[model samples]
Target chain A: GSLNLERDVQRILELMEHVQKTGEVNNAKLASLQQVLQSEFFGAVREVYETVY
Target chain B: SDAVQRAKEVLEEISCYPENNDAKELKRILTQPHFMALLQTHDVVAHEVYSDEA
Candidate 1:
């Protein structure tokens, strides 16, 4: 519950800032923003083994 | 001044369907890949749904 709530708030805030500045938002940027938020506030969220592009 | 009038007209056309008038087909079409490409028009009907309603 805590993680979900925290993520949701972070998402809302980040989206608001982004949308206010650019007047638009896209899903790819949202994924990148999620990664940033995880690194910023959610210490428990760690990077798992990532696949190569 | 001239641009503002045109923008108002465009918004009027966009909102003509009315916000509360939910069309399931429209929603589904907007979510499709083809309509994503159509968002290049931005501020038009298709782009309106993807960006504004997202």
Candidate 2:
């Protein structure tokens, strides 16, 4: 299965970068991160990291 | 330091729930490699110089 790492990473980066500016990580940001982690988005990242090392 | 800070707040939040399953699950999730990657991403985004500095 072709994985869309960019889609997940981009979304993750966007949400995270928002908190960077605001200087606070609210529940919405934290919840969003957990939701993505439970997705194949996380699987893609794990696979990529496993391959890269 | 807020990246590192809020991350701690989560840890702190989880610490109180020694037996709560959701809290335990979150504690587990926070340590996963993929989650760690996200944390690093947050940290990197935080470290980059921001216009907020006056």
Candidate 3:
């Protein structure tokens, strides 16, 4: 489940781009943001995927 | 549903987060190949639970 996150990895790439462009960590952090995106929000993706698959 | 989900979530969270020394040690214990061998030693346990019960 964790391994099948190529899309998520791309999302993280976009996030890194935004961070590089803005260089702002105010509301948009990278590490913590990635953690939240991957840890909690990821459950929704797995739930939906597994339900259909 | 949320309770079980939360418990599983927290457990995985703890397992993945290696920031703290205590959690690191705990992971070391649980994930160690030799220690995990004990779980493999009783590999039938998974078959027992994963099998159709009816």
Candidate 4:
């Protein structure tokens, strides 16, 4: 039910914070998390903001 | 109703989190001039949608 952009971004924020708290910090993790934020998530953000605007 | 603004607010929260590669990349993308314009437009539209019912 909460799959919208706002909730989705919220979840991403939580994940990052969760990492700071307890999630395993590793080399692969940085690349992996960075990749998602770099392309997939921001890509979707731009796409949605572009068309919706 | 104001999901776009809320989205921006959450992004700001994301800003407060630890600055790693992920956070830096997100900050870079979120601050894009085009993206900023888009967010502004979204708020405008949201305001239009916002005023009628409430």
Tens-place lDDT per residue, model 2, B1-54, is 354345435445435423334333443445444556655654565577574665
lDDT of 3 by residue, B1-54 (tens): 222232123334434333344322332333223323323433345446566767
User: Which stretches of candidate 1 lie above 4 Å from their native place?
Assistant: A1-23, A40-53, B1-54
TM-score against truth, every candidate: 0.20, 0.36, 0.27, 0.37
lDDT of 2 at B30: 52
Two-chain complex of model 2, DockQ on C-alpha atoms against the true structure: 0.09
Among these predictions, the greatest TM-score belongs to 4
Question: Model 2: how far is A23 from its true place, Å?
Answer: 25
Docking class of 4: incorrect
All DockQ scores: 0.02, 0.09, 0.02, 0.10
Segments in model 2 whose C-alpha atoms lie over 4 Å from true places: A1-48, B4-8, B21-26, B32-34, B49-54
**CA deviation > 4 Å runs, candidate 4:** A1-53, B1-5, B14-16, B21-24, B52-54
Off by over 4 Å in 3: A1-53, B1-11, B15-19
Return whichever of 3 and 4 wins on lDDT.
4
**Per-residue lDDT for B21-50 in model 1, tens only?**
222123222222222222232225334445
By lDDT, the better pick of 1 and 4 is 4
